[PDB]
Nucleic acid binder design. Structure first.
Lengths: 124, 330, 108, 333
RNA sequence: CUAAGAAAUUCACGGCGGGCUUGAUGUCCGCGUCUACCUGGUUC
């Protein structure tokens, strides 16, 4: 796993507490350092600790890949993105929470999508 | 050096129309040409609060103060008459042919190899496998989505029109033919060969499809419903053509291409509509995942670019969503 | 309190400024605003024209204005379940309570 | 194993809109060409009797209210002056396949739900729900305010196989109660028929006619439409009635609410009678909710107990879950 | 007994020649609107 996929898998999910079975808790504890510990924790802080350990030249890439694989199996809820681009047909749709669907917003591609993402924010 | 073009588009084959609904009596379905139409009316509806409320705010005060609030809704409803018990649904369908040729392309080598691949497919095996499944989805009444469930009898009449006159008639019994199997009859194979000749450019076919369903006197039919953008305010509206309830053409086109049973998840669930990353909207999930190698966008450019032809049952899927149309590429 | 006075001045200068007021589109439905924020009698004043809006009870307009004001001030179980939505409704009630006395001294 | 984010269940036992007509008794066996009742117009001058603020000072708000003329225009449905009965006719069909959802996300959740309903049908039949549905058909409870004060009402039920009549049932709806669910010697045949329809072994189409002897020119009560403000002082400004293209009629959801008044297993009282099957089972004419989540007899809580963690509830109230899965609706988060 | 007291902006004018916007699509599930009434306004 690349580190770009690590920050991607850290930011696109919700923050959940008690989302792990105890077997996966000791499985993750077998794959982390000696000093730090996670118990009764939420998602973000775990992402911050493993990102700080991977920023350090102390934790390997296969081990952080096992950590992020386990976080990938565990978390099942995603954040709904605010904008969605239909790519061949050159259209941009915006999420409306009252219709529970995406309604038509404008015409454009990837540059216009990045522009409204930088102007309004990526997630809901 | 060989790669996928930037813009690549395909027009659709099997263009259907809308299906207008009409109402009459059974055993007068032979003279079913002056029957009146099923109209859309409106009515009012109120009801209690019955959704799963959040447990962070669940007290008897809110649950007894939410009852007295008055909820008034205006809905669109379409029924049968009180003296008629048969719903008639009629549309037309024409298949075109020329399926492997794009409508727009950028590379000059990519289209000359795509045409060669599709012509090699047609030379190895005709359109005789896809056409019997399309004729199967016409033979039963899968285009009646919710009007088919619980009906007493369904009957389908298919005419082939080659002038201002009919040339060949078919009659089927849509409940004897299942929604699960694809078995071959002798009367179904004539229609399969007809729409196989239409898909190959070797003729011009135009079919007129009528379906009769017996549900009961004054019962409720289910046309297609529209989208409303926004105290008695309307919350549901139904699609209509001039003074008549109708079904959209894309819904019948979706009910026609429920073809593929080669997806790796199951085969007892039954057929699925041909889509890339083959996905059912009512089920919520997506078969044919890109982590597996049974996509359209993986089998297509393994077949064309790297000359790795897939299995014979998986070439029908690629040809089926080339017949479907759309914009591929980048 | 400022939003009430802007609507009062807009009703006093908008309909009262233009010297014309014809029949509204859909007079069975467009007659509440045409009766409340409408001018006096004109050349088309029939028998039941100067004896309808000046003789009837001009007190439904306050509840009609409160029904418009209820959309702007959002209410739900987050405010109605708490004790601040009650004061937020009582403030609008004390504001619209003068809407029938100050907005009902013209005809009656 | 969690619950699915979406869950939709289609409706079984769907009726039509009931149409009304008028004739005479001792001619009700030839009641196929009876003229249908029309919605007529009349005027009403309103006298103020509403509870104002108590201890009102002046007569400037009460003796001046009399001199202000109120003008109302109402819709009314009346019997003719040569007819003394009311015929109400509709049809009904029961489908089957009750525990199968129309739409759901989770694939491992419906694998639990379908086998839960499967072992329910394997243990107990559909007969207990079916005999009370047949009881509500057998009394004239779908006549809401036309049933009161009537000297004699009766119910005909025809089972329709093709364009013909397969089986006829004739009942007396005042000889059987609106309060008790007790066994009969002919109603059990209707119960077995609609249970076979509910279980999937065949299709069932019933036609229900109800005659009510009221009086020579009385007033009947069809459904009432939600009126908009696009009318003048005359032009149905006060009360409009629902009429399907020819004649006055009752909505289909009113008869559907009158047919699922089946449950008597709510712990409020043992003498209050049956109510309609709802989640947080409530009454609108009474204003009171029952089956709150403070108690544990609420549909969502015991459904999640039964399906997820195998807490099989009491058998006498296990019929409540199937009774409001037959009803259909939008469940899930 | 007023940031008081005072004042002509004018004459003329050619916007214009060309053009392929396209290709696909499942809006779905459920519902109790009830109770009352003298127009003997002056429908001039």
């Amino acid at each position: 796993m690349k580190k770009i996929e690590m920050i991607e898998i850290s930011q696109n999910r919700q923050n959940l507490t008690a989302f792990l079975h105890i077997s996966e808790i000791k499985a993750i504890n077998a794959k982390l350092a000696d000093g730090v510990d996670v118990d009764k924790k939420s998602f973000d802080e775990i992402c911050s600790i493993v990102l700080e350990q991977y920023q350090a030249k102390q934790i390997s890439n296969k081990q952080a890949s096992e950590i992020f694989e386990t976080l990938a199996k565990a978390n099942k809820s995603f954040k709904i993105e605010k904008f969605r681009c239909s790519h061949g047909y050159n259209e941009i749709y915006k999420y409306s929470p009252d219709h529970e669907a995406y309604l038509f917003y404008c015409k454009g591609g990837q540059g216009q999508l990045n522009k409204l993402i930088a102007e309004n924010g990526r997630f809901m | 050096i060989l790669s996928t073009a930037s813009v690549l588009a395909f027009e659709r084959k099997l263009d259907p129309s809308d299906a207008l609904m009409s109402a009459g009596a059974w055993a007068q379905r032979d003279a079913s040409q002056e029957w009146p139409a099923v109209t859309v009316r409106e009515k009012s509806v109120r009801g209690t609060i019955s959704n799963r409320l959040k447990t962070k705010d669940r007290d008897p005060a809110k649950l007894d103060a939410s009852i007295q609030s008055p909820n008034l809704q205006t809905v669109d409803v379409a029924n049968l008459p009180s003296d008629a018990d048969t719903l008639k649904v009629r549309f037309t369908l024409r298949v075109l042919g020329g399926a492997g040729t794009p409508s727009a392309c950028n590379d000059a080598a990519y289209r000359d190899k795509l045409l060669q691949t599709v012509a090699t497919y047609v030379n190895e095996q005709g359109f005789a496998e896809l056409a019997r499944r399309y004729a199967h989805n016409l033979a039963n009444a899968r285009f009646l989505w919710r009007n088919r469930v619980g009906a007493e009898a369904v009957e389908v009449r298919i005419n082939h029109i080659r002038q201002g006159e009919v040339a060949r008639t078919w009659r089927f019994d849509a409940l004897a033919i299942g929604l699960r199997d694809f078995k071959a009859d002798a009367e179904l194979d004539a229609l399969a060969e007809l729409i196989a000749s239409g898909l190959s450019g070797s003729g011009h076919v135009l079919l007129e499809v009528v379906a009769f369903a017996r549900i009961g006197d004054g019962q409720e039919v289910f046309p297609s419903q529209e989208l409303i953008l926004d105290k008695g305010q309307k919350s549901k509206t139904l699609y209509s053509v001039r003074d008549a309830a109708a079904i959209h053409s894309q819904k019948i086109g979706n009910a026609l291409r429920t073809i593929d049973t080669w997806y790796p998840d199951e085969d007892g669930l039954g057929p699925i509509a041909v889509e890339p990353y083959g996905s059912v909207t009512s089920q919520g999930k997506a078969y044919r995942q890109p982590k597996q190698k049974l996509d359209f966008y993986t089998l297509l450019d393994n077949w064309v670019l790297r000359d790795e032809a897939p299995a014979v049952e998986q070439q029908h899927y690629v040809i089926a969503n080339l017949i479907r149309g759309g914009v591929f590429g980048e | 309190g400022q939003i009430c006075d802007e609507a009062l001045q807009y009703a006093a200068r908008l309909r009262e400024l233009e010297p014309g007021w014809s029949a509204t589109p859909g007079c069975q439905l467009h007659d509440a605003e045409q009766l409340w924020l409408d001018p006096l009698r004109a050349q088309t004043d029939e028998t039941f024209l100067q004896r309808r809006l000046r003789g009837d009870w001009p007190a439904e307009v306050g509840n009609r204005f409160a029904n418009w004001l209820n959309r702007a001030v959002s209410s739900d179980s987050q405010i109605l379940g708490s004790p601040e939505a009650a004061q937020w409704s009582q403030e609008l009630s004390k504001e619209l309570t003068m809407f029938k006395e100050i907005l009902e001294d013209e005809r009656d």
